[PDB]
């Protein structure tokens, strides 16, 4: 039988599992936790990601749309957060508009746990094994198949292993090692502060014009998004502050404990003190108690490939990214689509040698590697533009606009269907 082991039931692994289910490919999800938890973080999914969801199966996109929210329409206003003019009262000030970014096909955000809960409904219970904390991968002496070994002391067998086990992937460690110079995520030097406030309260402070649309407020060393989310009657305020310092290292298997700290209330206040009243007002709407999220990415120490032998990486295990152009989870869905399509070809074949399995995964990598690396770099650059790292873009709006629009187009208007046919063509070759 041809068996796919998916290590990790995050967004990437769950999306892949549904794609395989709907293509009649045998798989098992091995998840280290007792359940998929309840992490509430908000993830924004872009058009390219929504197309890949649909292509996996319409129920993946439906799972998403059932729990997602958005502003009215797909236009985002990019403003200069410093040089708002006219008043200290945002209700009568004039936002300093740089340009508008129109998102063809729109974007939506959801709580991660809500999307997880919808997707999991579509996966049979007998396809998910909890408390399976993958520790190592070896090769079976008799068969040459992968042997998974879990911390509970048990093993499993598979023809291919898909590491969907996130930013601190054990599958990645198995492939490429753990030493100080190994592929790994590192701090991107950006801290996330975010909150939701009742939409009517935001309108009372900022006025209706400034709560009518999504706005990204650029400025020196930090930026903030104010996004009115209609279906939840809330204004989402998402600030990112650049931090030249290192992130303190904590020994923990919990990614929350690794990448989150309590935030002293004055941190956001200080970062935005030189901004205009709209930004200072928005930031003041954060709860006095909040958390900060240290964003890590794989820009500096990327993996050299997504596949080795019968093992591969997808999602944040492969290409953890800053979220400056949308949640990096979107690319886990693109990865999942390619894997679903290639693995369906193997699942149909009378026999699949280790060579053919390995070549299949290599094809997956050939199709996704360059684009995936591009996102990690482009997203980091986007942060640099929005925080005026190199130049005051408040004073060069037209230039800024050309740069952001171009990179947005390459990401969001990607040929999803062509990616699949490319994969199947190359698979043929190999
Ligand atoms: C605190 C925090 C805040 C975040 N905030 C944001 C945000 O604001 N915006 C945004 O876009 N993204 C955010 N993210 C990231 C987002 O959750 C992920 O990008 C998204 O879930 C896609 O990642 P993934 O599915 O590839 O992997 P993950 O979501 O990391 O899923 C990995 C899964 O594999 C399991 N696993 C790990 N190791 C093993 C192992 N050895 N054996 C078995 N199972 C294993 C994990 O338990 C988990 O279920 C945040 C993440 C964290 C931790």
Q: 3-state SS of 210-270?
A: CCCCEEEEECCCEEEEEEEEHHHCEEEEEEEEECCCCCCCCCCCCHHHHHEEEECCHHHHH
Pairing label, strands 234-242, 222-229: antiparallel
Q: Round to whole Å and give the CA distance between 259 and 292.
A: 8
Q: Do residues 268 and 193 touch, judged by C-beta distance below 8 A? A: yes
How many Å lie between the centroid of ligand 1 and the Cα of residue 263? 21
Nearest CA owner, ligand 1 atom 31: 10
Q: Round to whole Å and give the CA distance between 20 and 343.
A: 8
Residue for token pair 């030189």 = 274
CA angle 80, 411, 43 (to 5 degrees): 75
Q: Token digits for 57?
A: 């199966």
Nearest CA owner, ligand 1 atom 22: 329
Q: Round to whole Å and give the CA distance between 32 and 132.
A: 4
Neighbours of 381 (CB within 10 A): 19
Q: Round to whole Å and give the CA distance between 220 and 388.
A: 5
Neighbours of 288 (CB within 10 A): 7
- Give every CB contact of residue 418 below 8 A, 6+ residues apart in sequence: none
CA torsion through residues 103, 119, 423, 315, sign:
positive
How many Å lie between the centroid of ligand 1 and the Cα of residue 243? 22
| Shortest-distance atom of ligand 1 to CA 327 | 11
**Direct distance between the N- and C-terminal alpha carbons of the chain, in angstroms, rounded to an integer:** 21
Q: Count H helices, E strands: the chain? A: 14, 19
Q: Round to whole Å and give the CA distance between 74 and 341.
A: 30
CA angle 134, 139, 142 (to 5 degrees): 135
The closest of 269, 266, 276 to 210, measured between CA atoms, is: 276
The closest of 338, 306, 313, 350 to 427, measured between CA atoms, is: 338
Pairing label, strands 160-163, 146-150: unpaired
Q: How far does CA 195 lie from the centroid of its chain? A: 18
- Give every CB contact of residue 141 below 8 A, 6+ residues apart in sequence: none
The closest of 347, 328, 341 to 411, measured between CA atoms, is: 328
φ, ψ for residue 137, nearest 5 deg = -130, 125
Please check whether the two domains, 1-70+107-185+298-430 and 72-104+186-295, share a CATH topology: no
Query: Which method, experimentally, gave rise to this model?
Result: X-ray
Q: Token digits for 245?
A: 């310092």
Catalytic positions, written as ranges = 194
Residue for token pair 């729990």 = 67
Neighbours of 203 (CB within 10 A): 17
Q: Which of 112, 131, 263 to mutate to test the pocket of ligand 1 (most atoms within 8 A of CB)?
A: 112
Residue for token pair 């399509």 = 341
Q: Do residues 106 and 73 touch, judged by C-beta distance below 8 A? A: yes
Residues facing 239 on adjacent strands: 193, 224
What SS3 class is residue 80? Answer: strand
Q: Which of 5, 7, 9, 10 to mutate to test the pocket of ligand 1 (most atoms within 8 A of CB)?
A: 10
CA angle 341, 427, 363 (to 5 degrees): 85
Domain ranges of the chain: 1-70+107-185+298-430, 72-104+186-295
Nearest CA owner, ligand 1 atom 37: 165
**Resolution of this structure in Å:** 1.4
What SS3 class is residue 414? Answer: coil
Q: Round to whole Å and give the CA distance between 54 and 62.
A: 8
- The CATH number of the domain covering residues in 72-104+186-295: 3.30.9.30
Q: Round to whole Å and give the CA distance between 85 and 96.
A: 7
Binding site per annotation, positions for FAD: 31, 112, 316, 329
Q: Do residues 149 and 138 touch, judged by C-beta distance below 8 A? A: yes
What SS3 class is residue 51? Answer: helix
- The CATH number of the domain covering residues in 1-70+107-185+298-430: 3.50.50.60
Q: In what order do the strands lie in the sheet with 26-30?
A: 128-129, 26-30, 3-7, 160-163, 311-313, 307-308
Q: Do residues 185 and 168 touch, judged by C-beta distance below 8 A? A: yes
How many Å lie between the centroid of ligand 1 and the Cα of residue 167? 7
Residue for token pair 């007998």 = 126
φ, ψ for residue 314, nearest 5 deg = -140, 160
Q: Token digits for 112?
A: 């991660």
The closest of 128, 101, 132, 94 to 14, measured between CA atoms, is: 128
| Helices 329-348 and 11-21, packing angle to 10 deg | 30
The secondary element (H helix, E strand) that includes residue 156 is strand 155-158
Neighbours of 373 (CB within 10 A): 17
Q: Which of 15, 36, 43 to mutate to test the pocket of ligand 1 (most atoms within 8 A of CB)?
A: 43
Q: How far does CA 430 lie from the centroid of its chain? A: 30
Q: Do residues 331 and 323 touch, judged by C-beta distance below 8 A? A: no
Q: Round to whole Å and give the CA distance between 43 and 238.
A: 11
Residues in contact with ligand 1 by the CB-under-6-Å rule are 7-12, 30-33, 36, 41-43, 112, 133-134, 164-167, 170, 192, 255-256, 259-260, 293, 315-316, 323, 327-329, 332
Breaks in the chain listed by the residue before each, with C–N > 2.5 Å: none
The closest of 189, 394, 120, 400 to 274, measured between CA atoms, is: 394
């Amino acid at each position: 039988p041809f068996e796919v082991a998916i290590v990790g039931g995050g967004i990437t692994g769950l999306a892949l599992a549904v794609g395989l289910l709907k293509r009649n490919v045998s798989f098992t999800i091995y998840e280290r936790a007792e359940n998929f938890g309840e992490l509430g973080v908000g993830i924004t999914f872009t058009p390219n990601a929504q197309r890949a969801m649909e292509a996996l199966d319409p129920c993946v996109l439906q799972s998403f749309t059932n729990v997602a929210s958005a502003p009215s329409g797909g236009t985002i206003n990019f403003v200069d957060g410093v040089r708002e003019q006219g008043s200290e009262d945002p209700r009568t000030s004039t936002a300093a508009l740089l340009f508008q970014l129109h998102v063809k096909g729109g974007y939506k955000a959801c709580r991660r746990c809500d999307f997880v809960d919808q997707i999991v409904q579509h996966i049979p219970k007998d396809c998910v094994q909890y408390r399976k904390w993958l520790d190592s991968i070896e090769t079976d002496h008799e068969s040459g198949r992968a042997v998974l070994k879990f911390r509970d002391g048990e093993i499993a067998h598979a023809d291919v292993v898909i590491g969907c086990d996130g930013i601190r992937s054990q599958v990645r460690a198995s492939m490429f090692g753990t030493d100080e110079l190994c592929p790994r995520a590192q701090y991107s030097h950006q801290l996330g502060y975010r909150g939701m406030v009742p939409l009517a309260q935001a309108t009372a402070v900022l006025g209706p014009e400034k709560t009518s649309s999504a706005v990204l407020h650029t400025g020196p060393g930090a930026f903030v998004l104010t996004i009115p989310l209609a279906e939840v009657h809330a204004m989402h305020i998402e600030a990112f502050i650049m931090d030249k310092e290192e992130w303190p290292e904590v020994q923990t298997s919990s990614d929350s404990k690794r990448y989150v700290l309590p935030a002293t209330r004055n941190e956001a206040t200080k970062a935005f003190a030189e901004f205009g009243p709209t930004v200072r007002s928005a930031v003041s709407m954060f709860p006095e108690k909040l958390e900060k999220w240290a964003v890590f990415d794989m820009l500096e120490a990327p993996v050299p490939t997504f596949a080795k032998g019968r093992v591969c990486l997808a999602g944040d295990a492969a290409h953890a990214s800053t979220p400056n152009q949308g949640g990096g989870a979107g690319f886990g869905i693109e990865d999942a689509l390619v894997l679903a399509e290639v693995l369906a070809v193997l699942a149909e074949a009378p026999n699949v040698s280790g060579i053919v399995a390995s070549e299949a995964l290599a094809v997956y990598s050939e199709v996704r590697y360059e684009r995936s690396q591009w996102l990690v770099r482009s997203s980091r650059r986007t942060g640099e533009l929005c925080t005026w790292k190199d130049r005051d873009w408040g004073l060069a709006a037209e230039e800024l606009s050309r740069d952001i629009i171009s990179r947005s187009h390459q990401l969001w208007d990607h040929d999803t269907a062509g990616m699949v046919s490319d994969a199947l063509a190359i698979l043929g070759e190999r």
